[PDB]
Write a protein that holds these residues in place. Structure first.
Motif, PDB file in Angstrom:
ATOM      1  N   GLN A  65       0.837  -1.157   0.000  1.00 25.41           N
ATOM      2  CA  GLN A  65       0.000   0.000   0.000  1.00 25.41           C
ATOM      3  C   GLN A  65       0.880   1.216   0.000  1.00 25.41           C
ATOM      4  N   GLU A  93       0.968   4.433  -2.676  1.00 24.02           N
ATOM      5  CA  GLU A  93       0.760   5.791  -2.298  1.00 24.02           C
ATOM      6  C   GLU A  93       1.910   6.678  -2.850  1.00 24.02           C
ATOM      7  N   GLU A 137      -9.395   7.518   2.994  1.00 27.39           N
ATOM      8  CA  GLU A 137      -9.499   6.814   1.753  1.00 27.39           C
ATOM      9  C   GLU A 137     -10.871   6.621   1.200  1.00 27.39           C
ATOM     10  N   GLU A 146      -7.409   2.591  -4.721  1.00 30.50           N
ATOM     11  CA  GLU A 146      -8.119   2.971  -3.534  1.00 30.50           C
ATOM     12  C   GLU A 146      -9.167   1.960  -3.055  1.00 30.50           C
ATOM     13  N   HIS A 187      -7.446  -0.488  -1.019  1.00 31.21           N
ATOM     14  CA  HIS A 187      -7.007   0.025   0.275  1.00 31.21           C
ATOM     15  C   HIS A 187      -8.163   0.063   1.263  1.00 31.21           C
TER      16      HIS A 187
HETATM   17 FE   LIG Z   1      -4.906   4.975  -0.518  1.00 24.87          FE
END
Ligand SMILES: [Fe+3]
Ligand SMILES: [Fe+3]
Ligand SMILES: [Fe+3]
Ligand SMILES: [Fe+3]
Lengths: 315, 316
Positions: B112, B116, B183, B217, B220
């Motif tokens: 992750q 990012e 998020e 996203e 996530h």
């Molecule tokens: Fe994210």
């Protein structure tokens, strides 16, 4: 040494220094201090690969036919490399937290991801070429081999000293330890898998290690350049005696890797012997030291003893 | 009063014992994991890999000079806010990850963090390509000029930083919920702006970049949904009635903040957006997000999707 804030509204624009700089931590790739971070970013994303896309069908057939000496080296080496890649996973983030150059933090975060991929590739190898009980006993070699356990405690102990007591020198030796790991411990492991593939055995897992090797080259240059900016910006702490400490961390690591490579091959791997292992690791340590401006430990060893590896290792 | 894990723990057990406080070695052994959903998430995440510079912006270069003043005002503030979001995610994730005692979950958070970093770079790539260096740096610095943007930034960073400096279990859980909000709410608000521009034919390739980000996203979101679900199950004495209500209120204030920000930057000058539509969209999203972690919605009276076209539009 104290760790960064999450976001520092009082920081100034851009990157000021590698450590101790007044930074915001914002990612702004057109406001960076180190030129070279931009081309490493690019090279690292272009090297992306997925272990499971490399087919192992022929290595499945060859694994049962490896001799007991070849299995002995395979099990202990792949378990040790899995340990190396996992402590890098855990410690790289640790080091990035005191680095005040956001463009460098970004590259260590990419590096951390790549280590996870490496470690996963070992799970893919072991779960595909053998059954679960044999897979689990390879993972657990450190629980049954006293020599391997003590390599693990030693290597993890250097990183652990900075994890528990963040002081500059501790941080500094921690940086050197990384470098030694990257450029010495892994390159020994690669030469085992290339020598079996050179004879026609376990060809596909050797392909996987050439991908791992390619990423490792960028990890080496990353730390090479990290050490030289740190010296440029903190030349009063890079004393003649601090640089000698690094040389001696390296000597000690050479000795361990040589003793280790001889222990797991046990003159039962065709194409390697104890003398050739000794001059290969020493020769590599000569290259690694000069790349960071330090005098070599073994000035008499100037010729590459295994030249075939560098063409073989490329894709 | 949480405690940081070791680099390597020789006395740990094989496999994974729990999410936090477990006796782990930190070794990566993918065939000995406790959270079976971790496996598929690894696979999915890797198959979503993309490189921002591989998407050409040639059409957006010609269109950028003819954006209205109102469109540029909204564009500059939003993309500088989103760059702050991903930057703090890149810095904070490893702080969360170092308290997590399930290596298969730590692997996912590291992936992750890498994603990012790619997101944040995407923004540098957009700004350096569609405009000149002096405009570019002005958009980077929009938070130094706009007090609303600055206070938002401080608010969001402060929740994370209270764990960063005081590692306690309640601060840890509030930070987890903060991430989830960030998020599932703040980013979704930003996406609807770029899709609204592209729906009109403006900045279409910038919108393609945001679809890739949107895709990441989603993963996530589901990751944090599962992390929270397991933490609840294994730490039920901490997840009181009362702490779940404090999560509901965190979402309430996030919703309130995001609506007022969305309204402020658009200023009724973006065609296809209006203050009430922004209000209704954000509230609708929070109902989905709260449901997904087993909590009662805050705005049950808003049950149909007020901007349904987004779901098909955002797909690749
Ligand atoms: Fe994210
Ligand atoms: Fe590696
Ligand atoms: Fe490495
Ligand atoms: Fe992101």
């Amino acid at each position: 040494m104290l760790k960064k804030m999450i976001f520092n509204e009082k920081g100034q624009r851009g990157t000021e220094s590698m450590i101790n700089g007044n930074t915001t931590n914002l990612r702004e790739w057109n406001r960076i201090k180190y030129s070279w971070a931009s081309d490493f970013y690019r090279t690292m994303l272009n090297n992306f690969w997925i272990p499971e896309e490399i087919s192992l069908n022929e290595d499945i057939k060859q694994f049962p036919y490896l001799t007991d000496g070849e299995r002995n080296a395979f099990d202990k080496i792949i378990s040790f490399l899995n340990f190396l890649d996992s402590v890098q996973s855990e410690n790289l983030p640790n080091i990035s937290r005191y680095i005040t150059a956001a463009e460098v933090s970004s590259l260590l975060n990419i590096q951390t991801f790549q280590e996870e991929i490496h470690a996963q590739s070992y799970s893919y190898i072991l779960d595909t070429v053998t059954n679960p009980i044999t897979r689990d006993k390879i993972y657990d070699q450190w629980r049954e081999d006293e020599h391997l356990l003590e390599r693990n405690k030693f290597i993890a102990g250097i990183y652990e000293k900075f994890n528990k007591e963040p002081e500059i020198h501790n941080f500094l030796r921690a940086i050197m330890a990384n470098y030694i790991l990257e450029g010495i411990y892994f390159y020994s492991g690669f030469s085992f898998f290339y020598t079996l593939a050179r004879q026609g055995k376990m060809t596909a897992t050797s392909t996987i290690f050439k991908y791992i090797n390619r990423d490792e080259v960028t990890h080496l240059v990353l730390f090479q350049n990290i050490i030289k900016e740190l010296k440029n910006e903190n030349s009063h702490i890079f004393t003649e005696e601090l640089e000698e400490e690094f040389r001696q961390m390296m000597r000690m690591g050479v000795e361990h890797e040589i003793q280790w490579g001889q222990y797991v091959t046990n003159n039962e791997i065709l194409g390697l012997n104890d003398e050739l292992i000794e001059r290969y690791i020493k020769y590599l340590s000569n290259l690694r030291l000069v790349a960071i401006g330090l005098k070599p430990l073994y000035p008499e060893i100037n010729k590459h003893p295994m030249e075939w590896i560098d063409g073989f290792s490329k894709l």
